[PDB]
Design a protein around this ligand. Structure first.
Ligand SMILES: [Cl-]
Ligand SMILES: [Cl-]
Ligand SMILES: [Cl-]
Ligand SMILES: [Cl-]
Ligand SMILES: [Cl-]
Ligand SMILES: [Mg+2]
Ligand SMILES: [Mg+2]
Ligand code: NA
Lengths: 6, 123, 123, 6
């Protein structure tokens, strides 16, 4: 899964 | 503005442990008296202050066989090697002293810190 | 077993990328349209289905120089090599087709799936 | 830090 790093 | 893959680092470590199991690209044998442990020097350098320090010298970095102090508990070492390749430790009453001593020798500061805390809670 | 160090895998990957920057224990150069990229074969095997398949053969495993298809975009490869060592990627309008193509070539399933999703969202 | 693997 992927997400925003920020 | 970057995208991150939350499981990537854990998957990389899993696959490196698979390569170790298959003896693929391993470049060192760690010897503890009569017990032997094949490994990747890059993983050793990435996890242990001892291995990082010796492998900064090109001469020692080239060694294919590295001997540890024979007073080291070899199961203590095995526990810590598996931790390098998995992020996981079994820390329990019967092994904590051996694991702590081995982690101090290997200069694995976060494992030492956690052992200290577990021991202190049993005082 | 039951105790996990949640930052361990990420710290290992960070330290591996530092070794790459320093050219420590690197064992391959990948060439893409006359641009050269140093790397650790263990990391390539752990991240790419192409490199995994190639390097399971002992003969190709020993190669110090490996050429990719001359139509591969070197910036796409650069992006994906940095992803291997960081878990992070910039996926944007201007690079998505080159990244997806390169990730397809390298057999990097999770990057491919994400690229697919991003393309479909723009019709 | 450490946590339970679960
Ligand atoms: Cl022994
Ligand atoms: Cl016990
Ligand atoms: Cl540690
Ligand atoms: Cl080197
Ligand atoms: Cl992937
Ligand atoms: Mg070489
Ligand atoms: Mg493009
Ligand atoms: Na070689």
């Amino acid at each position: 899964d992927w997400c925003l790093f920020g | 503005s970057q995208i991150q893959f939350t499981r990537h680092a854990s998957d990389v470590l899993l696959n490196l442990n698979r390569l170790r199991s298959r003896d693929i690209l391993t470049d060192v044998v760690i010897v503890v008296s009569r017990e032997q442990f094949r490994a990747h020097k890059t993983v050793l350098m990435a996890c242990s202050g001892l291995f990082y320090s010796i492998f900064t010298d090109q001469l020692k970095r080239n060694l294919s066989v590295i001997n540890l102090d024979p007073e080291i508990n070899p199961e203590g070492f095995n526990i810590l090697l598996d931790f390098m390749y998995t992020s996981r430790l079994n820390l329990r009453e019967g092994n904590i002293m051996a694991v702590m001593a081995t982690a101090m020798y290997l200069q694995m500061e976060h494992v030492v810190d956690t052992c200290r805390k577990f021991i202190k809670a049993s005082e």
